[PDB]
Amino acid sequence: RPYYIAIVGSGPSAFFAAASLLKAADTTEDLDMAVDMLEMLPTPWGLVRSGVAPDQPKIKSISKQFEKTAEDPRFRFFGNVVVGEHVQPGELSERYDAVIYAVGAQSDRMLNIPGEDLPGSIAAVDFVGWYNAHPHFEQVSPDLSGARAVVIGNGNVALDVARILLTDPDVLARTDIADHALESLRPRGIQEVVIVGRRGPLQAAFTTLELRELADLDGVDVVIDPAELDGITDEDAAAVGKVCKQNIKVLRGYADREPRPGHRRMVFRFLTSPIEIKGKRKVERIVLGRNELVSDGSGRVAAKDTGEREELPAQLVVRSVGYRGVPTPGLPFDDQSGTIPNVGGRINGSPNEYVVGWIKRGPTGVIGTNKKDAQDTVDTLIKNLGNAKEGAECKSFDHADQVADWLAARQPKLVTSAHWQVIDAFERAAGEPHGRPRVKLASLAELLRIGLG
């Protein structure tokens, strides 16, 4: 019989794992694989679909690789299956030789400041999900009519949020952005976005191309007070690394240009932390505080509050201070890191359950970083199966049909590969008349109406 492997989640780490498993079978005598992928949403691809910005179709095109993997007769997809709800980890570990958890980071890190949950104060997780038509975020529906938005954080997601708020909606109309978001963005309500970083430019988590692309926003002025960069030398930057030296150059380039009255603006503020979000019933203003950089002995510089304060009117606050993993019922979890504890990708205390991607490593790295991660986990998984075989300890298992029928019993509204293909064709066809790659079905009800029709 082949080995039966379940993968939970369908993002990059899941697909890289699936490819690794099938390639091992393809290159190894007396080794065969069957892969079942269980996904919470009706649609695959995880953040490649729901995270990467709608103005980034080329980077999204890694999806072609995932499609090639899914063409394999040994591969099956079951969407609209929530592990922890419809089926439990213990049930999966008994019906499969091994199970790989590739669930990513489904929630947000909080600021832990007063006023944070006022209407108008949201996470990038919610805002990105909403603009990319993730069905769990359809009702986020932020008011985008106010003149100023504030984005907290200095990572690349912070730039995505700023860029989408200020991009010419005519440009966005040619993308797979959610129709509901395009509608809210069309009136161009936001006149200024302020990106607020707690440490300095040298500590920014941004990468260079992502900073450079802000120049392509037609008519939008990128504003940086030259005082944010004064005293930072080429030597200081080079001492952090190559990426930082390039970043600093690009930031100086923005600082060197005076903004134009009446133009939309993206403003970078460094050494600044949000202190308190204020308003009667919704966000009206934010209190910002100034930090200084201080060594804490860890080999990092820390931001330390100086006490200095200013208040800035604002109508939207988006915290882009990191995604965060969510515990899965039946599996161990590290609350502080939002990861599943593991040894070499094998789940703590488990002989046959594994982790890959952001649930294993934390929310760091580009899509490509998940490839070696998945390979390493898969190598270990296969080693462990082999050790069980040479010791004659492999499980005894029409098992493929039995499992598929059981999944259907637990979730009658599951979405097979075939039914995903229906959604996919529909969404792409919807984009044709107006020259968009696709128009997404933005709620579970709509996805299932098409998928399960």
Contacts of 38 (CB under 8 A, 6+ apart): 6, 7, 8, 9, 78, 81, 83, 87, 92, 407
Q: Which of 155, 142, 208, 157 is nearest to 47 (CA)?
A: 157
Contact partner at residue 24 from ligand ODP, ligand FAD, a copy of itself, none, CB < 5 to 8 Å by partner kind: a copy of itself
- Residue 188's H or E segment, with its range, is none
Q: Whole-number minimum distance, CB 132 to Na ion, in Å? A: 12
> In the sheet that 346-347 helps form, which strands lie side by side, from edge to edge?
342-343, 346-347, 353-355, 98-101, 3-8, 33-38, 75-79, 415-416
Among 55, 97, 108, 160, contact with ligand FAD (rule: CB under 6 A): 160
Using CB distances below 5 to 8 A depending on partner kind, what does residue 12 bind out of Na ion, ligand FAD, ligand ODP, none?
ligand FAD
Do 237 and 202 contact (CB within 8 A), yes or no?
Answer: yes
Binding residues for ligand FAD restricted to 312-371, rule: CB under 6 A: 323, 328, 357-358, 365-367, 370
Per rule CB under 5 A, is residue 228 in the interface with Na ion? no
Residues numbered 372-401 forming contacts with a copy of itself, rule: CB under 8 A = 379-380, 382-383, 385-387, 389-390
Per-position x/- string for 323-362, each x denoting binding to a copy of itself as judged by CB under 8 A, each - no binding: ---------xxxxxx-x-xxxx-x-xx-x----------x
Verify binding: residue 56, ligand FAD, rule CB under 6 A: yes
| Shortest reach from residue 277's CB to Na ion, in Å | 25
The CA distance from 124 to 122, in Å, is 7
Helix axes 63-70, 12-27, angle to 10 degrees: 50
Among 58, 71, 298, 396, binds a copy of itself (CB under 8 A): 298
Residue 222, both tokens: 């990128």
- The token pair at 320 is 């882009």
Residue closer to ligand ODP (CB basis): 8 or 162:
162
For the chain, counts of helices (H) and of strands (E): 17, 19
Q: Where are the beta strands (DSSP E) in 392-435?
A: 415-416
- Residue closer to ligand ODP by CB (options 321, 441) is 321
Tell me which DSSP letter residue 87 carries.
B
Alpha helices in 284-368 (DSSP H): 358-361
Q: Which does 341 bind (CB under 5 to 8 A by kind): ligand FAD, Na ion, a copy of itself, none?
A: a copy of itself
Residues 259-298 that bind ligand FAD (CB under 6 A): none
Taking the C-alpha atoms of residue 273 and residue 49, their distance in angstroms, rounded to an integer, is 31
Shortest spacing between CB 210 and Na ion, in angstroms: 5
Query: Which of 68, 186, 242, 304 touches a copy of itself (CB under 8 A)?
Result: 304
Burial (CB < 10 A; 0-12, 13-18, 19+), residue 280, is exposed
Contacting positions for ligand ODP (CB under 6 A): 111, 152-158, 160, 197-199, 203, 205, 207, 210, 273, 320-323, 363-366
Binding residues for NADP(+) are 109, 154-157, 198-199, 210, 365
Q: Considering the complex, state which of residue 235 and residue 335 has its C-beta at the smaller distance from a copy of itself.
A: 335
* Radius of gyration for the alpha carbons in the chain, expressed in angstroms and rounded: 24
Place of tokens 């039914």: 419
CA distance 76 to 5: 11
Q: Please, which residues bridge with residue 7 across strands?
A: 37, 100
Smallest gap from residue 198 Cβ to Na ion (A)? 20
CB of 354: closest distance to ligand FAD in angstroms? 13
What would the x/- binding string for Na ion be over residues 143 to 162, using CB under 5 A?
-----------------x--
Quick check: 297 binds a copy of itself (CB under 8 A)? yes
Minimum CB separation from Na ion for residue 181, in Å?
A: 16
DSSP per-residue codes, 94-158: HHSSEEEE-----EE-----TTTTSTTEEEHHHHHHHHTT-GGGTT------SSEEEEE-SSHHH
For the CB of residue 362, give the shortest distance to a copy of itself in the complex, in Å: 8
Q: Which residues are annotated as a binding site for FAD?
A: 13, 39, 47, 83, 358, 365-367
The residues that bridge with 304 in the sheet, in sequence order, are 292
User: How does strand 192-196 pair with strand 148-152?
Assistant: parallel
Residue in 291, 300, 295, 251 with CA at minimum distance from that of residue 272: 291
199 binds, among a copy of itself, ligand FAD, ligand ODP, none (CB under 5 to 8 A by kind): ligand ODP
Nearer CB in complex with ligand ODP: 11/79: 11
Contact positions vs Na ion (CB under 5 A): 160
Contact positions vs ligand FAD (CB under 6 A): 8-14, 38-41, 46-47, 51-52, 56, 59, 82-84, 102-104, 106, 128, 157, 160, 323, 328, 357-358, 365-367, 370
Contact positions vs a copy of itself (CB under 8 A): 24-25, 27-29, 31, 295-300, 302, 304-305, 332-337, 339, 341-344, 346, 348-349, 351, 362, 379-380, 382-383, 385-387, 389-390
